[PDB]
């Protein structure tokens, strides 16, 4: 009479955590959702044969609509497990679903997997100065988000660092690069002409975190905007102002641009 | 020639994900570090047993200080695996010790696992919403810092969550415990008078993440500055403004008054 909300990773089946492996082994029924995240090192397949079990995955609607009509039913009378990308309450609304689950006389465990979230560290920005995070919505129609573009000035304005989370289609098969957020972000520029990002902003990004070689790259958006970063999911960081060693990994490690490293204290 | 930082995740040895357990294991050195935190919920013992290596600690003067003579050598012609808990990376020293390695001639790639930063989703609070992050250190002799009172202030003023490490002695394995930590943070209130941290004060503990019975409270300072929170390690959130459907998670998941409904959102 369990549910395990189990986090998958940043990029391969194997990214799970032990924990979450040996006990999604011994679920009786295992549900999953592909939409929030995108793994780009694995398949559907893998994480079956890693896991042993038949993997029914949930589209947007299953869940936010029917998850209490699809999954919390069986919950009731067995142990059931729900995978999801990356930890299954960073960046999601699946947090809500526990509450569900409460209201549904189900116990519900959570096992968590390396996030984005975190994950932002191999950046050698120091975690602890990043400030409130934001998405990069894809404009549609007549509606174009901005709103993540003030959290860049505010977070700027105290020097903490912006984690920029990348938006997802993933019926459509659509992951934003960083360079489509970083022409979004200059479009955005010309409208509220707030000197929050132009072509000599520094930016850093990191794509295919988990994988052994993520593209981890910093520099200024004139430079990086038309760079290719190689395949999703991306992220993009604008920096606050750095210390001198992050800049020294910055450019060490991401090859940023020398000139970083003199920093204006 | 290759060199692995490897998370060891949260509270056990079955925090580690798969990815990295197999990696140590192919390893023909195993090295990892116990100064920045600890793995409450498990020993070294039980980990060397998980991993099937003998595991070579190291304090952190052999990592800050000797690490290019201790771990980079053997890892010029071995294939070396450096563990640290949580993700690697987020401990702040930690990054610049991959540009010790490109310096070295030594490859190095790193192995992630969940951190506290993401973890701390499951309180329920949003992880955008959170603002600068700090440390709440022990005063002593003549020192009283209090830097950690200005972060929430900042934060808190513009609708932010601040997550609050406590301070650690790992070596003499002693833990600052939230209650401390809400005693300390009266005694700055009551120095610095900003209205920041008051008996009225909503805030969340969070005990033993990655157990799969964590302590999850929420509540007023009032409340909760008494309560048994359990075992370390423990983690103090002060909430900004909450969204109702934080307040009701925190509610019905953390056993909040009521009260946060209408006064918190
Ligand atoms: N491996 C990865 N590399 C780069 N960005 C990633 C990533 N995994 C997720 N993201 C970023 O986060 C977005 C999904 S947001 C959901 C995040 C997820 N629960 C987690 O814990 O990571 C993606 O569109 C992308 O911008
Ligand atoms: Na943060």
């Known amino acids: 009479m369990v549910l395990y ?28 959702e592909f939409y929030t995240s995108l793994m780009a090192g694995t398949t559907l397949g893998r994480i079956q044969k890693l896991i042993g079990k038949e993997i029914r995955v949930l589209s947007r609607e299953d869940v936010e609509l029917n998850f ?17 990308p990356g930890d299954p309450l960073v ?16 116990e519900s465990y959570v096992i968590h997997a390396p996030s984005i979230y975190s994950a932002v560290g191999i950046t050698g920005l120091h975690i602890y100065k990043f400030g409130k995070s934001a998405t990069v919505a894809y404009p549609e129609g007549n509606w174009f988000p901005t709103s993540y573009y003030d959290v860049i000035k505010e977070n700027a304005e105290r020097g903490l660092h912006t ?49 052994l070689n993520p593209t981890i790259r910093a520099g200024y958006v004139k430079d990086l905007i038309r760079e290719d970063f190689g395949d999703p999911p991306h992220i993009l960081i604008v920096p606050g102002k750095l210390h001198i060693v992050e800049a020294e990994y910055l450019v060490e490690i991401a090859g940023a641009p020398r000139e970083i490293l003199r920093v204006n204290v």
């Open 5 to 32: 909300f189990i986090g998958l990773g940043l990029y391969d089946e194997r990214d799970i955590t032990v924990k979450g492996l040996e006990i999604a082994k011994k679920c009786d029924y295992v549900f999953a």
């Open 68 to 84: 209490e009509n699809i999954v919390l039913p069986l919950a009731k009378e067995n142990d059931v497990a729900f995978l999801t």
């Open 91 to 106: 960046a999601t609304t699946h947090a809500e679903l526990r509450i569900r689950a409460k209201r549904a006389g189900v």
């Open 163 to 211: 984690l920029l989370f990348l938006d997802i289609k993933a019926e459509k098969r659509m992951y934003m690069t960083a360079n489509e957020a970083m022409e979004l972000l200059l479009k955005v520029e010309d409208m509220k002409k707030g000197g929050v990002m132009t072509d000599d902003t520094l930016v850093v990004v990191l794509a295919r975190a988990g994988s």
